[PDB]
Amino acid sequence: VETFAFQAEIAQLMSLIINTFYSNKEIFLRELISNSSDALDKIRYESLTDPSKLDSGKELHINLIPNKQDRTLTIVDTGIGMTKADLINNLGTIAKSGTKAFMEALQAGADISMIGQFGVGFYSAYLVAEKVTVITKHNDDEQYAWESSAGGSFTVRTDTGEPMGRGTKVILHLKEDQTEYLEERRIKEIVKKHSQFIGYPITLFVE
């Protein structure tokens, strides 16, 4: 298991998300679904010129899996996936410059719901999760598990867990007071409100 420190700017972004009083937490799901849609667009684009890019899975979709026993909400996509280098480099984002722009926007009057406009929407997971685990598999690399409970560090390890073929699985270990995001009616409402124009099938699993 390798343990890394977040860059100071990303640790600052995470503590702002965790510590700021902000009631509109539901936007985390829109942000993660948007990230999954972007990853699916990437593998679809590569497949237009190289059909073998889909040998690791032809179906392009997003699954939402609530688990009340484990208190987890998992977002699975069959997108391009991330390499080990992408995971270490802030989950394939330009998070240092994105955080800079987002901070300036907040100081000027913007609110946390605009996070996605700054390319750091993944971190909105911390509005509802005490810990986030990311399992990913890119065609050019092995399957890895990234994990962080914030606190300034994250871990990366080769995942010997259930093989995914290709794509990313974001496992949200929800905060005790955020279990409404495991309720079918609540998830359905959020997807309908914020993710109505996502161009891939979103399947909400039942328990």
Ligand SMILES: Oc1ccc(-c2n[nH]c3cc(O)ccc23)cc1
């Ligand atoms: O370069 C890449 C960057 C990101 C990803 C990616 N795939 N699905 C996700 C879900 C997320 O919540 C966050 C990031 C991703 C894939 C490739």
